[PDB]
Amino acid sequence: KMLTQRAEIDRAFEEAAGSAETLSVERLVTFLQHQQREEEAGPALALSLIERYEPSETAKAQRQMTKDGFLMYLLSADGNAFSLAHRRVYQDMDQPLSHYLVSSSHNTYLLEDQLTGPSSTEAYIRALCKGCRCLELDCWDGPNQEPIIYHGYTFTSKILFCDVLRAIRDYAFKASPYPVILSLENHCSLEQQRVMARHLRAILGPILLDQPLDGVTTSLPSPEQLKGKILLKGKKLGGKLVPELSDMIIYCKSVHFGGFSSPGTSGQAFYEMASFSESRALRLLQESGNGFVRHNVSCLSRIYPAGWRTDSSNYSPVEMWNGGCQIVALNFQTPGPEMDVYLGCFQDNGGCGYVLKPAFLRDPNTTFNSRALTQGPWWRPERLRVRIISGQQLPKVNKNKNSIVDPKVIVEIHGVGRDTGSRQTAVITNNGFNPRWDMEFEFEVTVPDLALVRFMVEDYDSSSKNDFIGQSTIPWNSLKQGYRHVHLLSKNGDQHPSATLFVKISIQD
Ligand SMILES: [Sm+3]
Ligand SMILES: [Sm+3]
């Protein structure tokens, strides 16, 4: 009569049933296909839900759904605002690497700042477990002929190259079976480069991709063709680099950006990879546009934090993704809206690290440009309507010494320039347990395939700004309609024990 007794869960259930106290399979299929806008909505689905969520056994045997089970469903995997069908790998995985968005880390060794902070294998472990696929090892000479990793010329803690590798070996495929790219930033002496080469082949072993693939000769292989393998990125012999090492760079030869060009008469190759500071990438996306998109169809593009970000702060990755850029390196060790939109995007596709870019970005001859949209398959404007109905059991350990929270839900649309919007509810004074808002927002999203819906919850405070409580980012095409519950993740991406936001989602054309 407290934890339960969700006024709005009653308000939505009676709506369903009508005048009955339970949901007939017939009535349910109506709720599912009409409210829940379910394409599967038919007797069979409606029955799976009853058998998979109905608490009352009798009401389950007599093929019905009670308010208890109606709730048990809404709070469940199936009730979630994030398409449960997407919690599994479900996209084409036979496209070239340049047709995927690779989950990328920057200065992975770092656990904190870029100047005096610690470096730890824990950093590579934690990143790999967040499904990160492209790691970064800044290699340098170490005492007694053993290379070390650390952010050169700073007081950042140093760690052993070998240790870092053992760590990568163990956790590389815990969260995904898909290929991990080890970006090497070499500074070691030739004798220590030889050491690096010996540890790579010795520690990594068969997991390492030492030789090219037969048949792959005109374009990068696929995540499938490289499953459970690791490839190395770095400089490759143009003649200060040991053959032992260079022979290991096969599909990710580090090159300097020499300009775009299109398939018409020679340019960068599918095995070569340019890199860009967030600033430069933003410059080229403005000056070149689809010149860059086309460019990323064939080759991989690695983006990386500006240098002025010693605080290990991050950049919004969306604008980079919109330009086809695949290896957008962010400081995973830093909580913030940026890493939020980052992992959120990557929870998609079973959270396997690789995410197939929209078809218009895999078109070598595409004329798409995120900063100056034209007409094309990309322009397919919808209209999202989100009813921030009722949040429940919102965190409150942020202020250990007990009192009460002042909640407010911010809903923001992340996407192409035009679609980049945001809204928010009124603060519900002192109530994090059963806050009610019943407020609907409305967004117009011209280019949905590049959009992500972010539900964020704050703690209004005139003391120290509106404190962060929890949030959840859902990629547009992964958003479910009707009545759903949004499960709030913590500041570290760790889904809170039982913190959610009940909402009603709608998408019209
Ligand atoms: Sm570096
Ligand atoms: Sm308060």
From Swiss-Prot:
What remark does the entry make about the cofactor? Binds 5 Ca(2+) ions per subunit. Two of the Ca(2+) ions are bound to the C2 domain.
UniProt-reported outcome of changing residue 138 to A: Lowers activity 1000-fold
Which residues bind substrate per the record?
Answer: 233, 235, 275, 302
Q: Please list the reactions this protein catalyses.
A: a 1,2-diacyl-sn-glycero-3-phospho-(1D-myo-inositol-4,5-bisphosphate) + H2O = 1D-myo-inositol 1,4,5-trisphosphate + a 1,2-diacyl-sn-glycerol + H(+); a 1,2-diacyl-sn-glycero-3-phospho-(1D-myo-inositol) + H2O = 1D-myo-inositol 1-phosphate + a 1,2-diacyl-sn-glycerol + H(+)
PI-PLC Y-box domain location: 245-362
| Keyword tags | Calcium, Glycoprotein, Hydrolase, Lipid degradation, Lipid metabolism, Metal-binding, Phosphoprotein, Repeat, Transducer
What domain of life does the native source organism fall in? Eukaryota
- Chain residues that bind Ca(2+) 5: 459-461
The Gene Ontology biological process annotation of the record reads: angiogenesis; cellular response to calcium ion; G protein-coupled receptor signaling pathway; labyrinthine layer blood vessel development; lipid catabolic process; phosphatidylinositol metabolic process; phospholipase C-activating G protein-coupled receptor signaling pathway; phospholipase C/protein kinase C signal transduction
Q: Which residues bind Ca(2+) 4?
A: 404, 406, 430
Give yes or no: UniProt keyword Hydrolase.
yes
What Enzyme Commission number(s) appear in the record?
3.1.4.11
A GO molecular-function annotation: phospholipid binding
Q: What is the effect of changing residue 304 to A?
A: Lowers activity 600-fold
Q: Active site: which residues? A: 106, 151
Which cofactor(s) does the record list?
Ca(2+)
Annotated binding of Ca(2+) 3, by residue: 107, 136, 138, 185
Q: Where is the C2 domain?
A: 362-490
Paired cysteines (S-S): none
Q: Tell me where the transmembrane regions lie.
A: none
One GO CC term, this protein: cytoplasm
Ranges for the PI-PLC X-box domain?
91-235
* Assembly, per entry: Interacts with TGM2.
The role this protein plays is: The production of the second messenger molecules diacylglycerol (DAG) and inositol 1,4,5-trisphosphate (IP3) is mediated by activated phosphatidylinositol-specific phospholipase C enzymes. Essential for trophoblast and placental development. Binds phosphatidylinositol 4,5-bisphosphate.
The protein's name is: 1-phosphatidylinositol 4,5-bisphosphate phosphodiesterase delta-1
Q: Which residues of the full protein are shown?
A: 206 to 756 of 756
